[PDB]
Amino acid sequence: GAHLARRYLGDASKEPDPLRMPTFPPDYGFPERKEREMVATQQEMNDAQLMLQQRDYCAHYLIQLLKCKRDSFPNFLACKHEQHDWDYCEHLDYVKRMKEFERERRLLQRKKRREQREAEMARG
Amino acid sequence: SFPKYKPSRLATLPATLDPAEYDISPETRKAQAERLAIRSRLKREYLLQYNDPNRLGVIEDPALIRWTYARSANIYPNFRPTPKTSLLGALFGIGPLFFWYYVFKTDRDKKEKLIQEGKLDQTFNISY
Amino acid sequence: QQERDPWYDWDHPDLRLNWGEPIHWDLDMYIRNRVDTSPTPVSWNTMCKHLFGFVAFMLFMFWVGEIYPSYQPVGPKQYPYNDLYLERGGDPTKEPEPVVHYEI
Amino acid sequence: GGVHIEPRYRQFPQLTRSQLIQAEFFSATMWFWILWRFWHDSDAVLGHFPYPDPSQWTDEELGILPDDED
Amino acid sequence: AFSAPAAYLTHQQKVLRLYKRALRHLESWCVHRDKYRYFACLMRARFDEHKNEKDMVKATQLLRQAEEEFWYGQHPQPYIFPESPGGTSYERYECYKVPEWCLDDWHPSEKAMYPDYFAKREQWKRLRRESWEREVKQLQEETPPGGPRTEALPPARKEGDLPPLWWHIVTRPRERPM
Amino acid sequence: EHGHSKMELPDYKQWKIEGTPLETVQEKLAARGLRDPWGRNEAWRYSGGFANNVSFVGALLKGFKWGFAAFVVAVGAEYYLESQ
Amino acid sequence: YRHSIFAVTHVLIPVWIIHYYLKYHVTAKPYTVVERKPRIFPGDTILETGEVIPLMKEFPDQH
Amino acid sequence: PDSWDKDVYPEPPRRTPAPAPQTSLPNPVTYLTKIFDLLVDRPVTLAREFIEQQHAKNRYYYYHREFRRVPDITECEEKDILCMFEAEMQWRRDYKVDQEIVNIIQERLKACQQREGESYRQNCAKELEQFTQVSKAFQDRYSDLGAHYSARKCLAKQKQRMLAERKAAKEAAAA
Amino acid sequence: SDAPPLTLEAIKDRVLYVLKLYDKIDPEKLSVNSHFMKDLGLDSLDQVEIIMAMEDEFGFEIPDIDAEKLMCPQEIVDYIADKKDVYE
Amino acid sequence: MTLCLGAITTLFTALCAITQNDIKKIVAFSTSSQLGLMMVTIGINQPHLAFLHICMHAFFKAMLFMCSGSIIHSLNDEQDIRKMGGLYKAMPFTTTALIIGSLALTGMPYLTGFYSKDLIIEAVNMSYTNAWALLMTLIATSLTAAYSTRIIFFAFLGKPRFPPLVLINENNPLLINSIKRLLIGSIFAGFIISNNIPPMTVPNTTMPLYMKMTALIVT
Amino acid sequence: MLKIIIPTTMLLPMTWMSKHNMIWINATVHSLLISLISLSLLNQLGENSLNFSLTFFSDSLSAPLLVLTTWLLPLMLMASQSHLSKETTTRKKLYITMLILLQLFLIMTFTATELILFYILFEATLVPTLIIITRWGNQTERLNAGLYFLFYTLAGSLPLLVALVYIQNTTGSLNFLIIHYWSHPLSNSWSNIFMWLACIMAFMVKMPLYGLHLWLPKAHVEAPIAGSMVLAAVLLKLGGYGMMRITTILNPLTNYMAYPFLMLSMWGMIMTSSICLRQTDLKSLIAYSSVSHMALVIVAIMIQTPWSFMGATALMIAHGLTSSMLFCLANTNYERVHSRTMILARGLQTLLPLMATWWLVASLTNLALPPSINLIGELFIITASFSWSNITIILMGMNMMITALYSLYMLITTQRGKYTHHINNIKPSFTRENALMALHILPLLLLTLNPKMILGPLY
Numbered sequence A: 001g002a003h004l005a006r007r008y009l010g011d012a013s014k015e016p017d018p019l020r021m022p023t024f025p026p027d028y029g030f031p032e033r034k035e036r037e038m039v040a041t042q043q044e045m046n047d048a049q050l051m052l053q054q055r056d057y058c059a060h061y062l063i064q065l066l067k068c069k070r071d072s073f074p075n076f077l078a079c080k081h082e083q084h085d086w087d088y089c090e091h092l093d094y095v096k097r098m099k100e101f102e103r104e105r106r107l108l109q110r111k112k113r114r115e116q117r118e119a120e121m122a123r124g
Numbered sequence B: 001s002f003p004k005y006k007p008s009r010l011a012t013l014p015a016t017l018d019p020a021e022y023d024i025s026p027e028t029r030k031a032q033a034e035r036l037a038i039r040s041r042l043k044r045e046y047l048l049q050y051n052d053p054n055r056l057g058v059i060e061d062p063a064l065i066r067w068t069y070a071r072s073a074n075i076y077p078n079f080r081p082t083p084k085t086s087l088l089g090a091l092f093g094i095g096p097l098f099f100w101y102y103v104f105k106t107d108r109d110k111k112e113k114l115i116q117e118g119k120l121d122q123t124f125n126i127s128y
Numbered sequence C: 001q002q003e004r005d006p007w008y009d010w011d012h013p014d015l016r017l018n019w020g021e022p023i024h025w026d027l028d029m030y031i032r033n034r035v036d037t038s039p040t041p042v043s044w045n046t047m048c049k050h051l052f053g054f055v056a057f058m059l060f061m062f063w064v065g066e067i068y069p070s071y072q073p074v075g076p077k078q079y080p081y082n083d084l085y086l087e088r089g090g091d092p093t094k095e096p097e098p099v100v101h102y103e104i
Numbered sequence D: 001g002g003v004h005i006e007p008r009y010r011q012f013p014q015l016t017r018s019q020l021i022q023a024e025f026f027s028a029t030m031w032f033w034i035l036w037r038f039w040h041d042s043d044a045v046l047g048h049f050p051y052p053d054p055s056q057w058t059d060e061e062l063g064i065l066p067d068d069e070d
Numbered sequence E: 001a002f003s004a005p006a007a008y009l010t011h012q013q014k015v016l017r018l019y020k021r022a023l024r025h026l027e028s029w030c031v032h033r034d035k036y037r038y039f040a041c042l043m044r045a046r047f048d049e050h051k052n053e054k055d056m057v058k059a060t061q062l063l064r065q066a067e068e069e070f071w072y073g074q075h076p077q078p079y080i081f082p083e084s085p086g087g088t089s090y091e092r093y094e095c096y097k098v099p100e101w102c103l104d105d106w107h108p109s110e111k112a113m114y115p116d117y118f119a120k121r122e123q124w125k126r127l128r129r130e131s132w133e134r135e136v137k138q139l140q141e142e143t144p145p146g147g148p149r150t151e152a153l154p155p156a157r158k159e160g161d162l163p164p165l166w167w168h169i170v171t172r173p174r175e176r177p178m
Numbered sequence F: 001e002h003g004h005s006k007m008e009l010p011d012y013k014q015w016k017i018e019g020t021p022l023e024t025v026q027e028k029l030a031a032r033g034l035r036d037p038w039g040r041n042e043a044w045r046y047s048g049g050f051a052n053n054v055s056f057v058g059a060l061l062k063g064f065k066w067g068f069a070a071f072v073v074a075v076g077a078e079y080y081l082e083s084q
Numbered sequence G: 001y002r003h004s005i006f007a008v009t010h011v012l013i014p015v016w017i018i019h020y021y022l023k024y025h026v027t028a029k030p031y032t033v034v035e036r037k038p039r040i041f042p043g044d045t046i047l048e049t050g051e052v053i054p055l056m057k058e059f060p061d062q063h
Numbered sequence H: 001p002d003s004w005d006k007d008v009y010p011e012p013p014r015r016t017p018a019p020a021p022q023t024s025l026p027n028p029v030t031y032l033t034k035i036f037d038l039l040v041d042r043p044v045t046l047a048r049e050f051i052e053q054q055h056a057k058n059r060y061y062y063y064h065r066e067f068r069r070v071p072d073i074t075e076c077e078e079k080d081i082l083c084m085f086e087a088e089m090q091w092r093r094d095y096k097v098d099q100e101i102v103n104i105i106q107e108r109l110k111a112c113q114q115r116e117g118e119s120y121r122q123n124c125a126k127e128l129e130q131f132t133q134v135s136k137a138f139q140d141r142y143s144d145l146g147a148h149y150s151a152r153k154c155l156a157k158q159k160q161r162m163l164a165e166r167k168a169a170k171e172a173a174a175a
Numbered sequence I: 001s002d003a004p005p006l007t008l009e010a011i012k013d014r015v016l017y018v019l020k021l022y023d024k025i026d027p028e029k030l031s032v033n034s035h036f037m038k039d040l041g042l043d044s045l046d047q048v049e050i051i052m053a054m055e056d057e058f059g060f061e062i063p064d065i066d067a068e069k070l071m072c073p074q075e076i077v078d079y080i081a082d083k084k085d086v087y088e
Numbered sequence J: 001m002t003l004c005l006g007a008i009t010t011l012f013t014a015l016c017a018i019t020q021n022d023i024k025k026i027v028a029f030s031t032s033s034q035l036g037l038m039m040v041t042i043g044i045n046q047p048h049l050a051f052l053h054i055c056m057h058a059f060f061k062a063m064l065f066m067c068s069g070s071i072i073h074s075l076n077d078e079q080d081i082r083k084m085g086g087l088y089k090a091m092p093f094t095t096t097a098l099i100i101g102s103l104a105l106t107g108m109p110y111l112t113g114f115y116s117k118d119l120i121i122e123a124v125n126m127s128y129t130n131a132w133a134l135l136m137t138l139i140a141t142s143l144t145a146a147y148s149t150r151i152i153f154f155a156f157l158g159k160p161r162f163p164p165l166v167l168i169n170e171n172n173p174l175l176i177n178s179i180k181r182l183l184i185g186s187i188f189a190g191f192i193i194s195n196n197i198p199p200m201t202v203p204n205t206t207m208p209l210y211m212k213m214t215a216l217i218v219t
Numbered sequence K: 001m002l003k004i005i006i007p008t009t010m011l012l013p014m015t016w017m018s019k020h021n022m023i024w025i026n027a028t029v030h031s032l033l034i035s036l037i038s039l040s041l042l043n044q045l046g047e048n049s050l051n052f053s054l055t056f057f058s059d060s061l062s063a064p065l066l067v068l069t070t071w072l073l074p075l076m077l078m079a080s081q082s083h084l085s086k087e088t089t090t091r092k093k094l095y096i097t098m099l100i101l102l103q104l105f106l107i108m109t110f111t112a113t114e115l116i117l118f119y120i121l122f123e124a125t126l127v128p129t130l131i132i133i134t135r136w137g138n139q140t141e142r143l144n145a146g147l148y149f150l151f152y153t154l155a156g157s158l159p160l161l162v163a164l165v166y167i168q169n170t171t172g173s174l175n176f177l178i179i180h181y182w183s184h185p186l187s188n189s190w191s192n193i194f195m196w197l198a199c200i201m202a203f204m205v206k207m208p209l210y211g212l213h214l215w216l217p218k219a220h221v222e223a224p225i226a227g228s229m230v231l232a233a234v235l236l237k238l239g240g241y242g243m244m245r246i247t248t249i250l251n252p253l254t255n256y257m258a259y260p261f262l263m264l265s266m267w268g269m270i271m272t273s274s275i276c277l278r279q280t281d282l283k284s285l286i287a288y289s290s291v292s293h294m295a296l297v298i299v300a301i302m303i304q305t306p307w308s309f310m311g312a313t314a315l316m317i318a319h320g321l322t323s324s325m326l327f328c329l330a331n332t333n334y335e336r337v338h339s340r341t342m343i344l345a346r347g348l349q350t351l352l353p354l355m356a357t358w359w360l361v362a363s364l365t366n367l368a369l370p371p372s373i374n375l376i377g378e379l380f381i382i383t384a385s386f387s388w389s390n391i392t393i394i395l396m397g398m399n400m401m402i403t404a405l406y407s408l409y410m411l412i413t414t415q416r417g418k419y420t421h422h423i424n425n426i427k428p429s430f431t432r433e434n435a436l437m438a439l440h441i442l443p444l445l446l447l448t449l450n451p452k453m454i455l456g457p458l459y
């Protein structure tokens, strides 16, 4: 999609360009601005040599999943729990990405509203 | 009425759509009869020489030798310098050479210039 | 040679030629192994228009789809350590500008 | 290497019970496997994590101020 | 295939060939047998309504519109018998067809196997040797002056004669030699 | 070893148009004044083991019954074993 | 018997020859056979040194 | 192995994990590699012992040839054919040795890429830098001589390069 | 393949079978040597239909030039035997 | 370039397939469409998924030609589907093997082709790609289902259309065993291989409900 | 080098003092032994050369050509044994004498430390070939062919002689070692341009260059089998060897002067490969294929880079072997059918299966199937050309495609399809022909195991 229809058929400035997102400061919304937390360090995440595109904030669950698979080689089905933990963390990451998209969209809406309100006031 | 089939060089007219077969005349019939006569005479000669038990070799074919001789050795004595022939020969035998010369000369002059400014990035270029 | 009668008893059944009959100047061009001129169910110009039209449309629509891509309502994927600076190219003696990832 | 089955000429061909039982067995095995996987693993087709609604997120957690604060 | 061709096709032959081609292509269009039978009876009826036309110009104006209509609706992928000139097994077994004269080049150790076959082959060769001398004279006396007009051959006339030019028709390799 | 059993053809009087789609083909043909002469040449395609047909979905569900029974027995046995 | 002789003339002898050639001639030269440096995970211990890799940062486990 | 120098062809200390079976089910890899050991490795080992004893019965040596240093093409008169011959042979030998050096560095780089696996992009910067330096030097020496190369052409190329360097340095000084 | 080596008897029986299943001919008057045009009073369209039936029942095509001069069941059988090289 | 080439290839070849009469030609066009899908997967930067699809397609397409060749041999070298009639009962093991192969090809949950094709479709939907390429991939999936049902309907369902002398025979242990090995493959290999290989990409854990179902819907 | 030259000379009195029915056996045995002896020249150095004496020297460019020259004579004798059966003892001895003299001149040409000695022997090879073509050829065109093969050559070679003596009047020597060590640049002058042309054109005409290739189809088609074998295998390589030797004095003028010849070769390879697609004669098709391969070798030599020279050496050896094999196959067909028309005798696989296998392997090597040395040379030249200019890849790939097309067209036309019915004199292949084919083809597939033997002095 519905977002594509509102960006291709509606107003391009109404919704983000996914290439350049975000276009606003991070701490613009609220002054807390908590940091993201990473569990896997440089060295162990290197030694497990996962993948460059698997080296994200979800790496520790992948480490555990990999270890579980390795120990139980004969019983492949046994490490069901490790997989769930990893996909749940990826689900949270994707939800956070969706939240960033919606956040920037709302900020763009409010900025357009502020500029049009200011233009109305100035012309009045 | 149905859409009409338009023949081309590589998609010819069907035999059943040919107006000439529907326009019959006694002269056409005698032409067909004598074409069949020529074909039958040739077939009879070939089969007489083919079924012969004494024959132990290739059956000589004048048509094949005529084809090969015309394709190879009859060309130059029948050649004349003609505007069509002269222009076609000049074009097809010179134009590609000068075209490729221009292309390669331009490419190599560009390469040489870029090497002169040093902006080619010839790193790891060891084997040439 | 392909459109010559295949039910006739030719002296050369594969080439579909007779012994003494004159040979076309371009026989080796038409040997059923190569270009044939047999009539087609559809006219040559119609096929050319259809083939060209289909290719052009697909080509045009691929360019249009490049202009208007498809994606999901998500922000960029985030990577922890300075966008994986040391794992992608390195140069650990430069200390690049820190990129901070926002919590939401 | 097989059995002797003579031509029939316009009737149904002769069938051995071996091929029938094997075909039925393998069809039943395929359907049983599909059912077993669907019972044990339904989320491989339906999904396990609900899709969030972006319009249901409040303006508070996304850092939206009512147009005058910042 | 076997029969010698004529100088031309008569109007009846053209109509019959169009009938066969149209029926085959309608079968290609009408896959099922009941549908094909219904439409083929209709097709036969549509042929039959002008069976009795006496005007040759009218009949030739017909068959022409008919072949144009056929070319319009001819099922560009008709069914072909596998062994037919367009089939998927047309010339599949030509590589297995070996001429009979090749057996003359066999080593004597090879001919030591199959002695009865080669004895019968020798008998056939002797028969060919005599029959050929008879055949040449018979063909020379029977052919009209100025050369043959049609590539049709006469049968044997006397008791001990064999049909002229028979060796390469009788000694075909096989339809499926291997 | 080959198929040398001296196969004998069935009786030609066996084939009838009755009870086949060739019957309704003949009926619709008679409605306009024509007849199908080759109908009995094709009756063998609707006569013996070819008389009964199966649907596309029925073809897809070839072994659903006994496989489903195996599924229910397996799931019941697993429920009984794990409840222990 | 046929299977026993087949598994000797077609499996055992080729693997013997190839193992000899790889272990005593190919491996003689450097870099001819290069492996992957197997993955190391937290909590693993190494045969050569005996030291134990430290565990991870005890992330919160909930759901 | 002692058959090659470890310093010329270095390797990391080869850390390997220890087996940590979390289940009691027997993994077929262990049993299968044990039966491989029994059925393959021992007979091959015994055959090698036989061959090695037979070799030890007959021991003889071969030597690496030593080549003296001779004056190079710079200490050669313009038409003195004998010194030019000596210098040309020496230069060709040096060119071959330089090619072998580049080969050694490339072998190092390939081994690093295969060994470091998924993290080769970071864990092979040393070999990449070494190969870049060696490649730059080799290119500066021998890049464009073409077929019919010689010590004289290499010397002319070096003289041109270092004339350009001297001009650039003088321009920088007088900037 | 496993196709039986068909004989002249089989070809004759199968040709007569197809012909008796043609209802424009009464089977009891049918015979191997009976002419199609005069002994049975069939049109040339019926003859080409019979050729098509023979083709569809033996699985191969008879060319028009050969087919248009096959007027008896016996010579149809002979043509099929010559094409398929049947011994007895 | 790779994505666009794969998309146009799979669309064009499925479009050609849905109307062919030679069974081998239909299966060859199916192979071409599957190759186009593979290079679409490559073009969306998912190489390991393309390799997995290669491995699964091997099994089920090889078995599909097994069944086609069995039918051709039983019907005296006949390859046209207009002359192939009721073979569902006339030859049942080929029938069941071909049904299983078609189900694996079109994408049936928890079969061998599922573990590749379903993930292919999900990855194409969840990527920054051409709109046209995505549309053509979905249409190619639908046309894959179309030519599969074309083969089944015209070869196995109706009344017989082959010559009267029936020489149909499947009772040879070579054919049965060779087909059944690939049949067990086409049933279980996807599950086994997918659960045995280490994970080589981040999955798509969350999707819109309709967009997770898109492959099954179009099929 | 005399340990190879003297036995080749002794081949003559041995041939002329032989029994009337022992000439072929003795010639074949002793030529094979001479080949075996010459095989020890392959032990080359990484340094300068094998300088035997003031007159002869060996090089890793010369050694493969010498070994191929020595190996070609027994095959030529085996090929000539058949069609010379009905001819008198004195004339057969004369034919073998011509072959021996050709080998002797080629051997002395390839070592030839002197450029004038090289020219003298390089032109002395002309006489035996001309006599062989115009004496033991079959058709009436052979005389005309000989004239072409003569005058073209001399039209190129007479200026070279002048240039050569001119050089010695200025340099003081024409010894190749002194020339290489005392080489000096050529200034861009009209006199130097014409010296360059006089040095190049003689070797260009015998490659042959695309515009100057008219003599080759005639000479190769009208020559007997031994003549065609020696023309395609060794005599075409004299131009390449001479260019590789002489381009050392032509720098840096080669950079400018190479352009017209580079364009001629790059376009003429396409032209001649296309000509092969429409050819009614087997020998003419093989001759045009030779022209295409030598055009590629000309490009390689003109680029004058190490990879170019290695590829050119490998391609020269591989082409010699492959073209000799192809001519032998064509002649085996011709001696049965007596027509030399490709379309006449068809479907020979069903009658001659082993000869069909030989045809297939010869077409595969002509097609440059890896890892054959044909493809090794092809790829080295192509990579060198790509470094020279990235646009050469279009022409090179088009040439590869057309080469595969005409090679498989030649194979399919002659071996596949249906046999011609009226031809009933196709006898089973003799042991002599099969042995000849194997002796052509095993050296190729065995040289692919040790490529450095044929990669030249820049390896």
Ligand SMILES: CCCCCCCCCCCCCCCCC[C@@H](O)O[C@H](CO[C@H](O)CCCCCCCCCCCCCCC)COP(=O)(O)OCC[N+](C)(C)C
Residues within 6 Å of the ligand: K035, K039, K064, K067, K068, K071, K317, K443, K446, K447, K449, K450
């Ligand atoms: C019929 C079906 C097949 C049956 C037969 C089965 C057996 C097949 C095995 C043979 C082919 C398989 C290829 C495997 C090759 C094994 C041998 C090879 O490795 O040895 C080569 C050795 O062979 C030579 O390199 C190639 C032979 C040279 C060819 C010379 C041609 C003979 C003269 C003829 C006249 C010349 C005419 C052409 C003129 C140019 C390369 O060894 P290399 O690693 O390198 O060093 C040799 C050993 N060192 C280390 C001690 C130095």
Ligand SMILES: CCCCCCCCCCCCCCCCC[C@@H](O)O[C@H](CO[C@H](O)CCCCCCCCCCCCCCC)COP(=O)(O)OCC[N+](C)(C)C
Residues within 6 Å of the ligand: K188, K189, K190, K193, K209, K210, K211, K212, K257, K260, K261
């Ligand atoms: C036919 C089949 C093939 C046979 C072989 C063909 C190969 C022969 C091609 C000859 C190679 C090149 C010849 C001359 C090259 C010189 C460069 C020239 O082309 O460029 C311009 C040359 O300008 C003009 O060309 C001047 C000459 C004009 C007269 C030439 C006739 C033009 C067509 C003749 C072609 C016929 C060839 C066959 C003759 C029988 C640059 O002018 P400029 O920079 O100032 O002077 C450069 C030379 N300097 C430095 C030594 C002074």
Ligand SMILES: CCCCCCCC/C=C\CCCCCCCC(=O)O[C@H](COC(=O)CCCCCCC/C=C/CCCCCCCC)COP(=O)(O)OCCN
Residues within 6 Å of the ligand: K152, K155, K156, K159, K162, K163, K166, K190, K191, K192, K194, K195, K196, K197, K198, K201, K205, K212
């Ligand atoms: C396949 C048929 C080809 C026929 C031969 C093609 C090659 C032609 C090459 C030129 C032939 C003669 C060149 C002279 C030989 C080299 C000698 C030399 O380089 O000395 C030059 C001499 O240069 C000349 O005299 C050259 C004059 C050439 C006259 C003949 C012209 C022949 C045709 C010319 C046009 C075509 C040129 C290229 C044709 C290529 C082949 C197609 C300079 O010496 P000096 O003059 O003493 O010192 C300078 C101070 N005085």
Ligand SMILES: CCCCCCCCCCCC(=O)SCCNC(=O)CCNC(=O)[C@H](O)C(C)(C)COP(=O)(O)O
Residues within 6 Å of the ligand: E011, E012, E013, E015, E016, E022, E025, E026, E029, E046, E047, E048, E050, E051, E052, E053, E059, E060, E062, E063, E066, E067, E069, E070, E071, E073, E074, I043, I044, I045
């Ligand atoms: C589905 C694919 C496309 C189909 C479209 C084709 C449309 C065709 C319909 C056209 C109608 C016609 O008949 S076209 C009319 C052609 N002219 C005549 O029919 C005049 C005299 N008729 C004959 O001579 C016949 O042969 C006959 C006497 C019947 C038998 O003869 P025999 O006694 O010697 O068997």
